[PDB]
Design a protein around this ligand. Structure first.
Ligand SMILES: NC(=O)c1ccc[n+]([C@@H]2O[C@H](COP(=O)([O-])OP(=O)(O)OC[C@H]3O[C@@H](n4cnc5c(N)ncnc54)[C@H](O)[C@@H]3O)[C@@H](O)[C@H]2O)c1
Ligand SMILES: NC(=O)c1ccc[n+]([C@@H]2O[C@H](COP(=O)([O-])OP(=O)(O)OC[C@H]3O[C@@H](n4cnc5c(N)ncnc54)[C@H](O)[C@@H]3O)[C@@H](O)[C@H]2O)c1
Ligand SMILES: NC(=O)c1ccc[n+]([C@@H]2O[C@H](COP(=O)([O-])OP(=O)(O)OC[C@H]3O[C@@H](n4cnc5c(N)ncnc54)[C@H](O)[C@@H]3O)[C@@H](O)[C@H]2O)c1
Ligand SMILES: NC(=O)c1ccc[n+]([C@@H]2O[C@H](COP(=O)([O-])OP(=O)(O)OC[C@H]3O[C@@H](n4cnc5c(N)ncnc54)[C@H](O)[C@@H]3O)[C@@H](O)[C@H]2O)c1
Lengths: 249, 253, 253, 249
């Protein structure tokens, strides 16, 4: 007989895009579970509001100004976290935006900005984090925020669907490379969540759910906690879809 | 902010193949979380040993003699659970065997026995459980024990790989049909786990069984029971229709 | 530079369910490409109508009474083909039916009949064919008729979706086992095709059957027969173990 | 009863990376089938050698200097093809390179160059081609050269595996957007092919094939011809793996 593990006491997490939405709930949930959390965002003011909540709720957190498209910013922010809290055990690569246009109308600079935030952000934060996690094979957890759009397409979302598909590939390579250093990788794939990023609802957005339900920030934060606290590397390399039956993986 | 849901207080679960291995740990884990558990197995003596362990830890369980290939045995055993504990909230369709032979040598009898246990057992237990769960749209959770062999093949396991692929299909249909009645479905897909199904099999570990893991680790019964508890206690239907692979990187889903 | 291979001169094919629909067009297409074709069906009169069409076009075929759920009927019918034309190079396991009911209402008899036709038929025909193909490592091609329902579910089709998922598993095992004997395996996965299986079903097209296509088009029997000819005539084993979805964008594999 | 279709008489194809390897065989195969072919490559000399072969073999072709990372080069090259041969019916987005390093050692500029060639090249060539194909809903075929590495990972290939995964996503969005304009999309996913880009063979490279066989350039060119000449849009949005049993899709 066994039981669930959820204690993150003594762990340090970095969450990108943690000033808002999914990333904010993951960060607040990890802090409740005992982790010290780096709140990494391009919106430093909004990042410090998240830190203020975590600290008032009895946790530990640090606001980190980080544009995840910038190599120097990512490197500097990861170093600040390690200098403040002593290491980095968990990375959640979550920062993202949406830009909607059909391929034939889409500006090239909009395509490139989308790949830079979703794909370059994942590479840069992963590489910076694993230089620490690989030391003495201490290890750690890397979670990417994918989507149902990691697995299938929608109209007018070419760069988003391309990037969310690509994150599966990056996760799968890290699972293979990280194993000898006790690093595990995962992709969480939500359906539509009513964050700021989000008949329109029921006939377009939730049409391919089985039950006409949004995914919630708590759904994703519980899954992120289950993975981060899991006692073995059994889920390394996996994606898990959390979508109320929209794409059954 | 949130936290994990772990409580199954007031719930009633049926676990097939709960006399041994993965099913025994799921059943003991559910009982520790507060569920009353039906220990359904063809081995009634070993089923009662699971019940004794659950009772020794302060939980509630019932040994149920059930050959999951038999419609009467499934229907009667689900009815015995409902009569005893008042309903059925969770079904774990887990009973299974392995029979190894290449296709060109495999006895048709062995092909049919494999599909009867894995696929007919899943259909019969699902149908019997959802006739209760659909009443007043009370709902419930159906978990199938799949495999990495739900998603890819190995040599000499045709009927097993066929069946474990088939369970994804049945799960995906139930997710669509069950939604209006608050029924959710999932498939758990372990890699190799050192139960008796596998221990018997070894007389191989590093260069056959674990060759496509990233870290040369077996999956454990506690890995699968923790995932089974996470799903059964989950507070929303967000994972309905999904399979989750628990294999140390053997088939990255 | 290269070009398509289309020639099946000298080859012998067995197509199950070749009295109607997708199987009839595959069989007629193979015969036009030079294959001698066994027209295996439970409907012997309609099987002979396929043979008459093949002969009228200058091809060779044989009507074979075969209930693919019967081990004796499969073994005897494969042996009749080998006795007549000298061997078996290509098997297309295609016979099938549809039975629609939600899980909670579905008769167990109907569940078992569906798995017997789709899954036992695939096992029995595969095993009988590869005992010939494995001789002297001559080899051959085994194609299973899957579906979009190999990869995702629809309401009210539990046993069909289970079976079509299962055929991927059997194909994947055969690709591994058959390699040393020059046997390759594939699954073709059509979307809706307006055969009698579907025509009967309509008395729906735009908002159920074709709702998840990108272009509101049925798949056609000629789409599937062209893919079946491309695979059977292919000059290397490069596609062994693969499924190919032919559905106008319903499930993008 | 039916038969295979392979005639490309009256069609115009653009193949990127067509001076070498897979792209060269596709181009020569399309020209044999009657298409006029744009041989688009960064190596213009090698592109003109391919054109010389096609022309001596009785076909029609044009050498196009095209770095597929450059918006202007892609736009100019597609326009030259349309000015020379009257339109564009088929695009094969195939140009690629490989750069091998584990994530923790990989230079950021190597990550970005890989995504630019594989992903920006696919976007830029797609967008330029479909501005023509969408006119009067004439339509056309877009094929991306993926990989088994569209579907699973290998060690030390992070940006390649990320990009080849991403191409599935781009293809799936184009299938949905293109349908109303009679545009179909596909991804071909080869296993290892002995091009210049390619115990090492049998125990590493071909270890996950069922039969220890390389995929060949003719395997891929036959599949590319089957798709380009197919009489209906039935395969739109699909990937097809051609790998001797390495990843069974
Ligand atoms: N909301 C949904 O329906 C949904 C579903 C699936 C996946 N996702 C993914 O979840 C993630 C979080 O999205 P969300 O809905 O919570 O959005 P959100 O807009 O609420 O939060 C995104 C956060 O990322 C930050 N950010 C944006 N660009 C940044 C950059 N360059 N560097 C650092 N931080 C940056 C923003 O300031 C913001 O705080 C994204 O990757 C998104 O693609 C969202
Ligand atoms: N062990 C592994 O590596 C592994 C990996 C993936 C999936 N699985 C699956 O996990 C499930 C449990 O297997 P396990 O490894 O715990 O095996 P196990 O042999 O320890 O337990 C299987 C149980 O099923 C029972 N059973 C067999 N036939 C039955 C029938 N007709 N009716 C009722 N009960 C019956 C047995 O008596 C036994 O108690 C099976 O479905 C198996 O396919 C196992
Ligand atoms: N039509 C579709 O939309 C569609 C789509 C995807 C897959 N499929 C599959 O294609 C295959 C062919 O179906 P179809 O649409 O051409 O149907 P069809 O009804 O036109 O042909 C099926 C044939 O199978 C034969 N058959 C049935 N039971 C048999 C048995 N026990 N033994 C031997 N022959 C038997 C029938 O007599 C008939 O001639 C089936 O496996 C079906 O599941 C059909
Ligand atoms: N060879 C394999 O094993 C294999 C397997 C799967 C997929 N692939 C893919 O097939 C495609 C072709 O690879 P190949 O093996 O034939 O390689 P190759 O090296 O023989 O040919 C690649 C061609 O692309 C050209 N090219 C490179 N950068 C370019 C740029 N920026 N703009 C335009 N042209 C450029 C090169 O000059 C060359 O002519 C690639 O996308 C590769 O990823 C190859």
């Amino acid at each position: 007989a066994t039981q669930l593990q959820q204690d993150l006491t003594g762990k340090v997490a970095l969450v990108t895009g943690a000033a808002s939405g999914i990333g904010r709930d993951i960060a607040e949930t990890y802090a409740k579970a005992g982790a010290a959390v780096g709140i990494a965002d391009i919106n430093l003011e909004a990042a410090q509001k998240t830190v203020d909540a975590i600290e008032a709720a009895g946790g530990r957190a640090l606001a980190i100004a980080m544009d995840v498209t910038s190599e120097a910013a990512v490197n500097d922010g990861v170093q600040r976290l390690v200098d403040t809290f002593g290491g980095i055990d968990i990375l959640v690569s979550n920062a993202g935006i949406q830009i909607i246009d059909p391929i034939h109308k889409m500006a090239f600079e909009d395509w490139k900005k989308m790949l830079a935030i979703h794909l370059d952000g994942a590479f840069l934060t992963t590489k910076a984090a694993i230089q620490h996690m690989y030391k003495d094979d201490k290890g750690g957890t890397v979670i990417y925020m994918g989507s149902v759009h990691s697995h299938e397409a929608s109209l007018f979302k070419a760069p988003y669907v391309t990037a969310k598909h690509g994150l599966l590939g990056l996760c799968r390579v890290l699972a293979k490379e990280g194993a000898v250093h006790n690093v595990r990788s995962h992709v969480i794939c939500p359906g539509f969540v009513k964050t700021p990023l989000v008949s329109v609802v029921n006939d377009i957005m939730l049409v391919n759910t089985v039950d006409k339900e949004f995914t919630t920030v708590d759904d994703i934060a519980q899954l992120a906690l289950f993975l981060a606290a899991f006692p073995t590397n059994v889920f390394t390399g996996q994606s898990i879809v959390a979508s109320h039956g929209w794409f059954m993986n």
